[PDB]
Amino acid sequence: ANIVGGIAYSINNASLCSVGFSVTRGATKGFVTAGHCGTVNATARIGGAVVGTFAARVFPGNDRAWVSLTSAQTLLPRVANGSSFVTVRGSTEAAVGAAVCRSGSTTGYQCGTITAKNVTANYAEGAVRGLTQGNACMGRGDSGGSWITSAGQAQGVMSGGNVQSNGNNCGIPASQRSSLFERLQPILSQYGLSLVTG
């Protein structure tokens, strides 16, 4: 399969989440995603085919993971934007007030601004701290998906937010949205990963 940020993948033939970013760890191919998406050794599938397994994760406390892929997979420095693509050019962290977009299987490509940093989410499983907050909308299934600036700077991976009864927060104004992502930089350093860029 071609690995592109924002596309759907399944975990152990059950849950559905979104790809974060293509990465390498030496000769090993992979992608980063959210930790709540799967446990270590869980099997990831794209288009019905096994593509790899969860190599490591932290959730809760943090919300990060990476999936170790078979050599047959094709890593790409891209994030889905409809039929088009946003090129991943680096991982410069944007400041509060910056415009940012996110890509996921459920709500697709959505944009907003970064509104706060170091936010704590109180999930069913426990607290996750240090999250960055934006007001781009999102829905269930967008978890793990890319957050990236239009200029191609990868920001992090979708963790969660204040979804409504319809499963997303698209139906409320941006001013009322809390869409939270896990910063990319600590994921890269924790697992010794390098971002695939173009």
Short mmCIF file of C-alpha atoms in Angstrom, two decimals:
data_model
loop_
_atom_site.label_atom_id
_atom_site.label_comp_id
_atom_site.label_asym_id
_atom_site.label_seq_id
_atom_site.Cartn_x
_atom_site.Cartn_y
_atom_site.Cartn_z
CA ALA A 1 0.00 0.00 0.00
CA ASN A 2 1.03 3.62 -0.48
CA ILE A 3 1.44 5.32 2.89
CA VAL A 4 -0.10 8.80 2.90
CA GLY A 5 -1.07 10.89 5.91
CA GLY A 6 -4.77 10.90 6.68
CA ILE A 7 -5.80 7.62 5.03
CA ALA A 8 -7.76 4.93 6.89
CA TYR A 9 -6.24 1.81 8.40
CA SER A 10 -7.74 -0.89 10.64
CA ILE A 11 -6.36 -2.41 13.85
CA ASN A 12 -6.81 -6.15 14.45
CA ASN A 13 -9.68 -6.15 11.93
CA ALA A 14 -11.74 -3.99 14.30
CA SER A 15 -11.06 -0.31 15.02
CA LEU A 16 -10.48 2.28 12.29
CA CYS A 17 -7.97 5.10 12.58
CA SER A 18 -5.98 7.45 10.35
CA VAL A 19 -2.33 7.44 9.30
CA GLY A 20 -0.19 10.24 10.75
CA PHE A 21 3.07 10.48 8.81
CA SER A 22 5.48 8.23 6.93
CA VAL A 23 8.72 7.76 8.88
CA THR A 24 11.88 5.67 8.83
CA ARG A 25 13.85 4.11 11.66
CA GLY A 26 17.09 3.13 9.99
CA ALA A 27 16.12 0.59 7.34
CA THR A 28 12.70 0.09 8.93
CA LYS A 29 9.68 1.73 7.32
CA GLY A 30 6.79 2.98 9.43
CA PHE A 31 4.12 5.53 10.19
CA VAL A 32 3.32 7.49 13.33
CA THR A 33 -0.21 7.54 14.70
CA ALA A 34 -2.05 7.90 18.02
CA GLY A 35 -1.34 5.53 20.90
CA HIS A 36 -4.99 4.90 21.67
CA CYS A 37 -5.32 3.41 18.17
CA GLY A 38 -3.67 0.13 19.13
CA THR A 39 -1.55 -1.94 21.49
CA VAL A 40 1.92 -3.31 20.82
CA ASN A 41 1.90 -6.08 18.19
CA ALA A 42 -1.59 -5.21 16.95
CA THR A 43 -1.99 -5.82 13.20
CA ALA A 44 -2.55 -2.86 10.87
CA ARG A 45 -4.34 -3.24 7.53
CA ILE A 46 -4.86 -0.93 4.57
CA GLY A 47 -7.22 -1.84 1.73
CA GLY A 48 -7.76 -5.17 3.45
CA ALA A 49 -4.09 -6.15 3.37
CA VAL A 50 -1.71 -6.46 6.31
CA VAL A 51 0.82 -3.62 6.16
CA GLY A 52 2.55 -3.96 9.54
CA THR A 53 2.19 -4.02 13.32
CA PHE A 54 2.25 -1.58 16.22
CA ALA A 55 5.89 -1.38 17.35
CA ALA A 56 5.44 0.87 20.37
CA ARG A 57 2.89 3.13 21.99
CA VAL A 58 2.20 5.31 24.99
CA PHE A 59 -1.41 5.83 26.06
CA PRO A 60 -2.67 7.34 28.22
CA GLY A 61 -0.34 9.94 29.78
CA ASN A 62 0.82 10.65 26.26
CA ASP A 63 -0.99 9.57 23.09
CA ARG A 64 1.54 8.31 20.56
CA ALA A 65 2.48 5.21 18.58
CA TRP A 66 4.30 4.01 15.53
CA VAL A 67 3.48 1.15 13.22
CA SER A 68 6.38 -0.86 11.83
CA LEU A 69 5.70 -1.68 8.17
CA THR A 70 6.79 -4.48 5.87
CA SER A 71 9.39 -3.54 3.26
CA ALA A 72 6.71 -3.94 0.56
CA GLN A 73 4.99 -0.73 1.68
CA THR A 74 5.63 2.56 -0.14
CA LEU A 75 6.42 5.54 2.11
CA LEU A 76 5.43 8.95 0.77
CA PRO A 77 6.12 12.48 2.04
CA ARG A 78 2.47 13.42 1.68
CA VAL A 79 -0.82 14.09 3.44
CA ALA A 80 -4.21 13.65 1.78
CA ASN A 81 -6.22 16.74 0.86
CA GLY A 82 -9.26 15.47 -1.02
CA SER A 83 -7.94 13.98 -4.25
CA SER A 84 -4.82 16.11 -3.91
CA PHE A 85 -1.80 16.11 -1.59
CA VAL A 86 0.11 18.33 0.81
CA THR A 87 3.86 17.70 0.72
CA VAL A 88 5.55 17.08 4.06
CA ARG A 89 8.56 19.40 4.12
CA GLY A 90 9.65 19.34 7.77
CA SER A 91 8.51 19.41 11.39
CA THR A 92 8.87 23.03 12.49
CA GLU A 93 6.42 23.56 15.36
CA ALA A 94 3.93 26.39 14.76
CA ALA A 95 3.03 28.94 17.44
CA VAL A 96 -0.36 29.65 18.98
CA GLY A 97 -2.34 31.69 16.46
CA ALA A 98 -0.89 29.88 13.45
CA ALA A 99 -3.15 28.40 10.79
CA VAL A 100 -3.08 24.61 10.69
CA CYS A 101 -4.85 21.77 8.90
CA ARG A 102 -5.61 18.15 9.74
CA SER A 103 -6.34 15.10 7.60
CA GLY A 104 -8.38 12.04 8.59
CA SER A 105 -10.61 9.31 7.20
CA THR A 106 -13.83 10.61 8.77
CA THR A 107 -13.98 14.37 8.13
CA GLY A 108 -11.22 14.55 5.52
CA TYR A 109 -9.05 17.67 5.28
CA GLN A 110 -10.06 20.46 7.65
CA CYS A 111 -8.41 23.73 8.63
CA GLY A 112 -8.38 26.10 11.57
CA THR A 113 -5.93 27.73 13.95
CA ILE A 114 -3.87 26.67 16.95
CA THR A 115 -5.58 28.08 20.04
CA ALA A 116 -3.64 26.68 23.00
CA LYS A 117 -0.76 24.43 24.04
CA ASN A 118 -0.09 22.03 26.92
CA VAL A 119 -3.77 21.08 27.24
CA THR A 120 -4.87 18.07 29.30
CA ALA A 121 -7.57 15.75 27.98
CA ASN A 122 -9.46 13.58 30.45
CA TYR A 123 -10.24 10.46 28.44
CA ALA A 124 -12.08 7.35 29.65
CA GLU A 125 -8.72 5.56 30.06
CA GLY A 126 -7.01 8.39 31.93
CA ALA A 127 -5.47 11.82 31.51
CA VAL A 128 -3.33 12.75 28.51
CA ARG A 129 -1.22 15.88 29.01
CA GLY A 130 0.76 18.28 26.85
CA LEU A 131 -1.67 18.25 23.93
CA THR A 132 -1.95 21.12 21.46
CA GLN A 133 -5.41 22.51 20.79
CA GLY A 134 -6.79 23.72 17.47
CA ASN A 135 -10.25 24.66 16.24
CA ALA A 136 -10.28 22.69 13.00
CA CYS A 137 -13.18 20.24 13.21
CA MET A 138 -12.78 16.47 13.53
CA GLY A 139 -14.72 13.26 14.12
CA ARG A 140 -14.39 9.70 15.39
CA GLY A 141 -12.03 7.90 13.05
CA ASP A 142 -9.83 10.93 12.45
CA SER A 143 -7.70 9.69 15.39
CA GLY A 144 -4.02 9.31 14.56
CA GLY A 145 -4.34 11.55 11.52
CA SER A 146 -1.97 14.26 10.28
CA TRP A 147 -1.88 17.81 11.58
CA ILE A 148 0.16 19.93 9.19
CA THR A 149 0.52 23.55 8.09
CA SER A 150 -0.27 24.46 4.49
CA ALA A 151 3.48 25.09 4.13
CA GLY A 152 4.10 21.42 4.85
CA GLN A 153 5.35 21.54 8.42
CA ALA A 154 4.11 18.45 10.25
CA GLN A 155 2.70 19.38 13.66
CA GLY A 156 1.44 16.19 15.27
CA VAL A 157 -1.20 13.48 15.32
CA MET A 158 -4.92 13.66 16.13
CA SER A 159 -5.64 12.60 19.72
CA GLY A 160 -9.23 13.62 20.45
CA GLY A 161 -11.64 16.44 21.15
CA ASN A 162 -15.15 17.56 22.02
CA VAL A 163 -17.15 15.50 19.54
CA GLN A 164 -20.93 15.88 19.70
CA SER A 165 -23.78 13.37 19.43
CA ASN A 166 -23.20 13.12 15.67
CA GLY A 167 -19.63 11.89 16.27
CA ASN A 168 -17.82 15.07 15.23
CA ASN A 169 -17.50 18.73 16.18
CA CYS A 170 -18.17 20.11 12.69
CA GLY A 171 -21.69 21.14 13.67
CA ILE A 172 -20.57 23.68 16.25
CA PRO A 173 -18.76 27.00 15.64
CA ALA A 174 -14.95 27.08 15.55
CA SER A 175 -15.03 29.15 18.74
CA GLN A 176 -16.54 26.17 20.59
CA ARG A 177 -14.25 23.47 19.20
CA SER A 178 -11.49 21.74 21.09
CA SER A 179 -9.53 19.51 18.72
CA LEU A 180 -6.43 18.11 20.36
CA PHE A 181 -3.24 16.73 18.83
CA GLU A 182 -0.11 15.07 20.19
CA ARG A 183 3.04 17.00 19.28
CA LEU A 184 5.11 15.25 16.61
CA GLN A 185 8.60 16.16 17.85
CA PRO A 186 8.59 14.08 21.05
CA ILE A 187 7.25 11.09 19.11
CA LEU A 188 10.13 11.33 16.63
CA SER A 189 12.80 11.57 19.33
CA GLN A 190 11.25 8.93 21.61
CA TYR A 191 11.34 6.28 18.90
CA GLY A 192 14.32 7.59 16.93
CA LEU A 193 12.18 8.22 13.84
CA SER A 194 12.91 10.43 10.84
CA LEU A 195 10.13 12.11 8.89
CA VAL A 196 9.89 11.24 5.20
CA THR A 197 9.99 14.61 3.42
CA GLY A 198 9.76 16.04 -0.08
#
